[PDB]
Amino acid sequence: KETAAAKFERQHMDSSTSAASSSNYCNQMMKSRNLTKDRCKPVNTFVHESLADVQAVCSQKNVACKNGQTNCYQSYSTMSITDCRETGSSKYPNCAYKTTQANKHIIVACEGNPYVPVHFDASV
Numbered sequence: 001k002e003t004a005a006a007k008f009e010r011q012h013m014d015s016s017t018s019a020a021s022s023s024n025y026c027n028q029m030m031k032s033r034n035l036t037k038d039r040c041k042p043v044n045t046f047v048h049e050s051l052a053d054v055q056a057v058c059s060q061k062n063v064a065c066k067n068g069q070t071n072c073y074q075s076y077s078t079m080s081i082t083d084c085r086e087t088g089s090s091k092y093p094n095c096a097y098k099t100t101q102a103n104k105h106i107i108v109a110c111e112g113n114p115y116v117p118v119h120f121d122a123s124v
């Protein structure tokens with residue numbers, strides 16, 4: 001039964017590319033990572049850094065989570081990410097996404113032993 005940490009990796013890690021490959025990046029990735037299985041997940045972010053670098057964020061700048069919990073952390077450096085956002089025209093099961101590359105600080109929630117990312121909270 002997929003752990004929270006594995007789920008974070010599936011939903012949010014893509015070290016294989018350095019930045020939104022193409023205009024159809026999100027279309028392919030949202031599907032291949034099984035984020036369009038039961039619905040069109042409206043919004044999702046992929047991080048293009050090493051797993052080590054992203055895991056390291058859990059020991060970086062402690063900030064409040066959007067839900068009010070205290071276990072969020074913001075990266076000291078900007079990281080290469082891609083946001084995926086469902087287009088107005090998107091209709092399940094043909095989930096359509098706008099692919100946007102950027103370089104931003106990430107905020108993740110971390111839990112467990114080992115203390116690792118289990119939720120992507122925001123980019124800033």
Ligand SMILES: Nc1c[nH]c(=O)[nH]c1=O
Binds near residue numbers: 044045046120121123
């Ligand atoms: N706010 C967010 C929630 N979840 C994501 O994957 N990306 C975001 O930017």
